Subunit: 103 residues, 3 copies
Amino acid sequence: TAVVVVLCTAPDEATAQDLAAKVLAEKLAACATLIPGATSLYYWEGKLEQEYEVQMILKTTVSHQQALLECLKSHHPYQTPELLVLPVTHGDTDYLSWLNASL
Amino acid sequence: SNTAVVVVLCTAPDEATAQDLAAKVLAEKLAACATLIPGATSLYYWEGKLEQEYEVQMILKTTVSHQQALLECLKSHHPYQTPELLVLPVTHGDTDYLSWLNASL
Amino acid sequence: NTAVVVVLCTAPDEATAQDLAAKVLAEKLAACATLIPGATSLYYWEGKLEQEYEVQMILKTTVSHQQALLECLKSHHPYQTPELLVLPVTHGDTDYLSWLNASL
């Protein structure tokens, strides 16, 4: 029942949008915030890369994190996309139960 | 020594609301600073219906001793019924920056 | 694999954000950097409600490199005391975390 935030990035809004809609429909996450207009830098096969991406912030619970990450990975176009889980130590009571009631 | 700090996530319907919300909690000294990232889209089922709304992502910084009050303040002034209100722990940061946040409160 | 963390840093503009990112990536203090332009930073400064348009940075590194990353980011940052906060990562895709660790 403990809530966690999940970070993921997608190559464009379309991919991010149905990636979100898919895990939401599967009830593996209660909410998804998409932030386009981003840029990520990193090395890949020896070269510094700079890609345009959409930042995804999903909310779920510890109990569903593994399943959410699996689902996101399988549907994600990349082989190994960004999939990170951050802990939440506190939140509005009403928002937390709505969120739990949604999974 | 500095009190532990936290990051608060909250979304507002538009830039004007995000700004009023931020100014309010900054004035109340419940938040040291706030970052507003407009252009966001939130997807979630609301009462069985898949919604897709334009949102302004807010990231507020404060200390653990003010988090409870910050959330309550944000909830009161927020137009939404059940606004997103989550708190993430900051396990480390630049000492000087952490002092400024503490001093600001 | 060492525990992974996320570092938040705010830059005054894209040029600075990208240079900071390129720099720490080259020094191997971070494995990835996500830059989000168009962000607004509100806070009080000696009586004035400051409203700066800045760039939100999200960097990925490990706990064994967090201090060095912060020190490199700070000194290369044009500001004297920029936002530098570390958030813990409690879990993640095994292959992604392995790649983050391998990158450092």
